[PDB]
Design a binder for this molecule. Sequence first.
Ligand SMILES: *[C@@H]1O[C@H](CO[C@@H]2O[C@@H](C)[C@@H](O)[C@@H](O)[C@@H]2O)[C@@H](O[C@@H]2O[C@H](CO)[C@@H](O)[C@H](O)[C@H]2NC(C)=O)[C@H](O[C@H]2O[C@@H](C)[C@@H](O)[C@@H](O)[C@@H]2O)[C@H]1NC(C)=O
Ligand SMILES: CC(=O)N[C@@H]1[C@@H](O[C@@H]2O[C@H](CO)[C@H](O)[C@H](O[C@]3(C(=O)O)C[C@H](O)[C@@H](NC(C)=O)[C@H]([C@H](O)[C@H](O)CO)O3)[C@H]2O)[C@H](O)[C@@H](CO)O[C@H]1O
Ligand SMILES: *[C@@H]1O[C@H](CO)[C@@H](O[C@@H]2O[C@H](CO)[C@@H](O)[C@H](O)[C@H]2NC(C)=O)[C@H](O[C@H]2O[C@@H](C)[C@@H](O)[C@@H](O)[C@@H]2O)[C@H]1NC(C)=O
Ligand SMILES: *[C@@H]1O[C@H](CO)[C@@H](O[C@@H]2O[C@H](CO)[C@@H](O)[C@H](O)[C@H]2NC(C)=O)[C@H](O[C@H]2O[C@@H](C)[C@@H](O)[C@@H](O)[C@@H]2O)[C@H]1NC(C)=O
Ligand SMILES: *[C@@H]1O[C@H](CO)[C@@H](O)[C@H](O)[C@H]1NC(C)=O
Ligand SMILES: *[C@@H]1O[C@H](CO)[C@@H](O)[C@H](O)[C@H]1NC(C)=O
Ligand SMILES: *[C@@H]1O[C@H](CO)[C@@H](O)[C@H](O)[C@H]1NC(C)=O
Lengths: 175, 175, 175, 323, 323, 323
Amino acid sequence: GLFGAIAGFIEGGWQGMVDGWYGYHHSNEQGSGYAADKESTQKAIDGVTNKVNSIIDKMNTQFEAVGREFNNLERRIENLNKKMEDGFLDVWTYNAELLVLMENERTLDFHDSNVKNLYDKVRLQLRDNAKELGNGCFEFYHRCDNECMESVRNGTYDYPQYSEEARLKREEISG
Amino acid sequence: GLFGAIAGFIEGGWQGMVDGWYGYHHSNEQGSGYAADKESTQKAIDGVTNKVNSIIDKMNTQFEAVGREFNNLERRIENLNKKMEDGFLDVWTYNAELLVLMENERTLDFHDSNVKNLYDKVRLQLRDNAKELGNGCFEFYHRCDNECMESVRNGTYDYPQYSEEARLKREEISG
Amino acid sequence: GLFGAIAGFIEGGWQGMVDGWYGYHHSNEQGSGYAADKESTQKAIDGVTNKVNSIIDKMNTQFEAVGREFNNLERRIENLNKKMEDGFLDVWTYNAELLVLMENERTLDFHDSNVKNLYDKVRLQLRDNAKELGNGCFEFYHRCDNECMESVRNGTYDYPQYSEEARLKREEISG
Amino acid sequence: DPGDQICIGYHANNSTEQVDTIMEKNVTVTHAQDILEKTHNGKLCNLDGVKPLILRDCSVAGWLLGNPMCDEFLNVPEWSYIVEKINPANDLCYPGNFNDYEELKHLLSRINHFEKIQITPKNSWSDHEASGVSSACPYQGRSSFFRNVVWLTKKDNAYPTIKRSYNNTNQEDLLVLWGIHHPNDATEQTRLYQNPTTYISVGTSTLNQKLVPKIATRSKVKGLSGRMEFFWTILKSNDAINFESNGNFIAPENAYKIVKKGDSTIMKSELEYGDCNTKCQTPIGAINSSMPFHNIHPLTIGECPKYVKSNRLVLATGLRNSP
Amino acid sequence: DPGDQICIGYHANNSTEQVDTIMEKNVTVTHAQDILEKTHNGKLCNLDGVKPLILRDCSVAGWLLGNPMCDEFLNVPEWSYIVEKINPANDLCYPGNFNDYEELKHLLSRINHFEKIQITPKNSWSDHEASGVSSACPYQGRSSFFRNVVWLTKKDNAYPTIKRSYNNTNQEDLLVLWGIHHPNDATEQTRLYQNPTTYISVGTSTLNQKLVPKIATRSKVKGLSGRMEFFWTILKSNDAINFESNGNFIAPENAYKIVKKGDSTIMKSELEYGDCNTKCQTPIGAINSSMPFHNIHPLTIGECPKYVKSNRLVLATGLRNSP
Amino acid sequence: DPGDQICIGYHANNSTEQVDTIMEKNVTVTHAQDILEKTHNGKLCNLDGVKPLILRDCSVAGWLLGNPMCDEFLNVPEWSYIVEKINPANDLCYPGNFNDYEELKHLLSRINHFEKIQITPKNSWSDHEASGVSSACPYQGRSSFFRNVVWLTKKDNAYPTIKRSYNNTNQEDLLVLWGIHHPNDATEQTRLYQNPTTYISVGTSTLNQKLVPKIATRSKVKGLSGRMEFFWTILKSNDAINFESNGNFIAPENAYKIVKKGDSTIMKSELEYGDCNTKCQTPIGAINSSMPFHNIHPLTIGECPKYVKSNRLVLATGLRNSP
Ligand SMILES: *[C@@H]1O[C@H](CO[C@@H]2O[C@@H](C)[C@@H](O)[C@@H](O)[C@@H]2O)[C@@H](O[C@@H]2O[C@H](CO)[C@@H](O)[C@H](O)[C@H]2NC(C)=O)[C@H](O[C@H]2O[C@@H](C)[C@@H](O)[C@@H](O)[C@@H]2O)[C@H]1NC(C)=O
Ligand SMILES: CC(=O)N[C@@H]1[C@@H](O[C@@H]2O[C@H](CO)[C@H](O)[C@H](O[C@]3(C(=O)O)C[C@H](O)[C@@H](NC(C)=O)[C@H]([C@H](O)[C@H](O)CO)O3)[C@H]2O)[C@H](O)[C@@H](CO)O[C@H]1O
Ligand SMILES: *[C@@H]1O[C@H](CO)[C@@H](O[C@@H]2O[C@H](CO)[C@@H](O)[C@H](O)[C@H]2NC(C)=O)[C@H](O[C@H]2O[C@@H](C)[C@@H](O)[C@@H](O)[C@@H]2O)[C@H]1NC(C)=O
Ligand SMILES: *[C@@H]1O[C@H](CO)[C@@H](O[C@@H]2O[C@H](CO)[C@@H](O)[C@H](O)[C@H]2NC(C)=O)[C@H](O[C@H]2O[C@@H](C)[C@@H](O)[C@@H](O)[C@@H]2O)[C@H]1NC(C)=O
Ligand SMILES: *[C@@H]1O[C@H](CO)[C@@H](O)[C@H](O)[C@H]1NC(C)=O
Ligand SMILES: *[C@@H]1O[C@H](CO)[C@@H](O)[C@H](O)[C@H]1NC(C)=O
Ligand SMILES: *[C@@H]1O[C@H](CO)[C@@H](O)[C@H](O)[C@H]1NC(C)=O
């Protein structure tokens, strides 16, 4: 695919995460758990619903056929009439099928763009206070309660405020 | 965006940046400043200009309506003439709106892709001679005059020639 | 392209590689050589073969002109018939020309996305057991035979199995 | 040792729904939206509140002229649209043709309401016989004729020249109908109308017509070698129509006031009334849907979805689902 | 201390222009390009150098036959296109009809110039009276007639048989017009043409026509119950036309040589000349634009943008603008 | 030193194929696929196994009426399509016209085979001379006429009234042809048919026709100013056609049985037979191809590519090629 994320460096989804489309699974001393990133999910539920309404409204003015009748010595214009009406039904049938194929292709790659951007969102936040495992998981270098995990999800995580305990730990691995 | 650069990890554009579409905010000993990357902007103006030329000439052969008159016992063919002409006008009105709707969205994502590729253009060149601050900015582990800055913008930045000073400076921070 | 791989941070293609579209060049003690990633080229051939058939099957129902004759006092409908048939020929000519331009552009960006996803496939496996040179190449921090190279090409590369030999080597450099 | 962790991921579920794209067919997805209505109720219904005019085995010609087997429609109320069978059985009961029939039909599909009136009473024909009848037009086992026109024949042994006129003092326009009889031979001609060489003249502010019978021998149709040929005109308010004839004249008795115009159509269908109500009607059944597309039939009336020839149209709304 | 920096960014401005996409509406952008023309000048102009033929209250029929109220158009110069009102006041002044009118108007849109010539001098009729006139066709307060055809009647008490002929020895083709009068009763037919039973024969290498009057009773139109029916043909270069009649004949006096051929059309509009000039004209105003599209009117003539029904059409050229 | 490496890259070759995009033209690529057929063989061939009916210098009317100069076609075999020249030489040899000709030609495009039969023997006219002949219709150095219709004239000094009937007892439907003669003056009318005032009646289960001659003065065509006007009808199996006439009647001799209906067309071409074979034929040459599109001619018959007005259509299959 166009993306590398869904069915990529992250393989498979979480059946246990049933609150949104995108979010977090954390695993520390205070047990495990899931959390949905609403903001990125909100732009996604709003983004796709804009799409489906625009396509419906672009099609409200579309060819409508009406019956006309002809006698036995009007074969030529009867044939004109039939070929013209058939012609428009083929044109608009092509227009709808091809449009659904094209926007299906973008919709799937759209969710995918949002997964990679969210992953890149936190990788840019933590930096050298964590390790990239390479499958969507980050194992960081200090301890995080149930208000630290919260600080990254609302994007406030102060990097140097945890740099030291981390600095100690990566030197301990460097031992 | 679909790439994460515009309105993403780099926030907002620079009103002080008025020489191109994409570029740099540089800050060394010789003060502050703005600078445009010329090379990538030409391929960008050429790209949008080809698009609009392709979009116009693809529409130059299009249905033209002609007035035709019918008497009072030609209501059937009068009606045929009207549906056929109305029919072609809705088809080409649809064709023109949908093509502009589609290529707008791709034009915006073409700019987003071009910024990210530019960001990765300097990031792949510097590596550990600088740090990603997380906002599009790179802070060097050494000092860069106004002749170092140029070598990255024309893509010649000699890495090993400055690797030691950076490595020393970074160990000083890691102590 | 929209991804930066082909004609981007990777420059030029390899004429000597004649078994696939995307792949690997290895350089160890057992000489050099070229090698194609079969898996990604096949899914790439399947995508394009599906596309070209889809474009053919979407055009199988298309307007067909039939000859009709009119006498010297049927000029209005002779003109109607001619314009209706010419009208459909202009519409289906536009549909085929434009579909080809659009899918050409996406086909080219499909290969571009596929080269970069293969690159991140390898970058994610090695991490700090190798270095990004910035041109599509990885310089290892240990030794790779003709069975280590193979473990990376099929994605079985065991990381901790080389974590130690490597970590020491970069310290010799970073000291 | 393992420290604390955090991971990024996406939703999956037990969906099995598939969408298509141009590079790949049958892709399973978490959430999808079908946008194609594929079902109808198989009935003919009211459009909004308004009932259609459902002819049975009667054709448009049969109704307006008043074929005796079509007495159900002698006075119909306002309709919303009209339904007619492919090959109605009760058409022109006496053999012949209906001049400019297809143009009358097109006019009829721009009309929602007629109000029938009598313009020349059957008891005004005092020098001719106004009781013509044929076995090709039966009513209750006995011979009859069209109810809205009259077959005039000789009285005593004479057919005086007819001069009759009618002025449309109504505010709305009138649909007027009449005919001419073509006999089989010279002998039959003199028995019916006495005079051997005849004509019919009809005049209006815009109509200027002259008809002469064609006397000759033709194949038998329902046992008859004679023919009847019918005509129509629209008589505008405050105009007058003029008839003059010395034989073979099938004269007007009733005509129609055009009371309301609007969107209507003539549907070709074998169905009958279904005692239901809808906002979208097709020849094979009605539609109650919110889908933007449908694929049931191209000839529809009312507030409907758009027609396409597709078997499937389903949109991906969610994301790709893990096997 | 902080060392040196370098940052990545894009252009921004004080722009407020907005474009649309399928996922998001009213997105404000730094650079955009309009491609839809929405303004016209509201007048009728010359096309290139060439002035259009603007009939005022005249129709094509009024013009070509020579309605007495249309003497303005007795000899018109070369035109670029023709402008006509929806319901012109000077049409057929004597009530009746113009045969194959719409086909003739269609022929007219490949013609840019007529050159009128005489076929039969008004003083060449020495055995008929050639001065028929009617109050339905007034000129300056008195009774008159069409100028390009002549109304012949009996002289003394006779209408001898007419045999008249013409060979088109010109290089170009000829548009020839003629007619027949339908009286109200036998007395008028005798009063005007003496012979009770009459005909008109017209022959060409390809035309073989025979007309007979239809004498009958009709409504009064502008006080009259008589009717006139007009006919036309194109006479090929080097062919000949032959006329024969013993009554009811409205003979040709003038005919038209088609001297210049090209592209033209007939526009329906209420406007009058505007002393302006354009290369693209519509029925409600002219266009001076460079946009690839316009949305004024579907019927244009000249070198024009393509017509679409959009209210707005703007293309994103720049990038998304920061709030 | 440099250690061990592994690098990622893509395919290149020495190809010269170019593709176009919406943002960029002439992009060189490793692999491309042509989808537009641009070549034809310039000949007229059989369609599958079946040979076409190639009229030479004969037109369809000439063939069907049996112009004595089209005797090659008196009895043709089953055909796949029909080839007719733009301006055929052997058409109506006696000047005149063919009624509803273009509707008949349209009917013919649903027919693959005729079988000619004789319905009225030339020796059945015992009170008329059935040997009419003209110098405009030559045969072998002598004057002749159309073979499928017969020119009847007076015998001794009389022309009795004809009452003749034919019942189509064939299983298949019949194409029946007939005509009427328009003389130049009353005198010629008397030497050929004796009676001054004549008519022709034709009747069927659906047809009720009456023709009257138009005696008049016309230009000479091929030295003649007389005219012949022809008519046609399709007589259903087991129906009958009835003729009644006292002059100017061009009676049927041979008629055509519709033996096979199917897909056919009438092509306009100047070319001649080429003893070849194809499955796709156009008026200017045949096509043997596997491309999904072609640009040779819009008028084709058989199993063909889709027609477009493009000069080039090439699809990108590979990637961009490095110099
Ligand atoms: C219409 O007039 C043309 C030309 O003028 C005539 O030619 C003189 C001989 C004489 O008849 C003059 O009084 C006329 O004005 C005429 O064409 C000519 O016909 C004559 C007689 O055959 C020949 O000279 C020649 O055929 C032709 N001359 C020229 C210079 O073209 C037309 O009659 C004839 O036209 C030609 C083209 C043939 O088709 C011939 O059969 C035909 O009768 C005349 N139109 C008609 C319908 O008679
Ligand atoms: C039918 C009837 O009784 N009409 C009465 C009037 O007679 C007619 O009225 C009209 C309108 O007022 C005209 O004057 C008619 O006269 C003309 C005409 O057209 O103006 C006079 C022309 O000179 C004459 N032209 C020729 C060449 O003969 C023309 C024609 O004869 C007819 O048009 C042929 O169809 O008629 C006139 O005939 C009457 O004047 C009025 C008042 O008394 O009352 C009406 O009832
Ligand atoms: C149909 O009958 C009506 C009713 O009488 C006629 O309209 C009236 O006629 C009177 C008598 O001259 C006159 O006051 C008006 O013309 C009209 N009055 C009203 C109140 O409507 C009508 O005759 C006349 O109608 C006008 C419009 C015009 O055609 C005139 O020439 C005509 O005689 C009758 N219509 C016809 C066609 O005879
Ligand atoms: C054409 O000839 C055929 C052959 O005889 C007629 O069909 C037969 O007509 C006889 C006469 O009454 C009768 O036995 C049948 O009607 C029929 N029999 C057979 C074996 O075919 C035909 O005339 C008749 O055709 C039928 C269909 C019906 O319309 C009847 O009314 C009619 O007399 C002849 N065609 C015509 C037009 O008369
Ligand atoms: C897609 O799935 C449907 C579901 O039954 C199946 O019938 C069809 O054959 C499938 N198409 C392909 C190309 O496998
Ligand atoms: C988009 O902007 C226009 C102009 O400012 C405004 O009229 C319109 O209402 C906006 N869109 C919506 C959905 O309101
Ligand atoms: C693209 O290349 C072809 C190959 O010669 C050339 O004919 C054509 O002119 C080129 N395109 C343009 C726009 O000139």
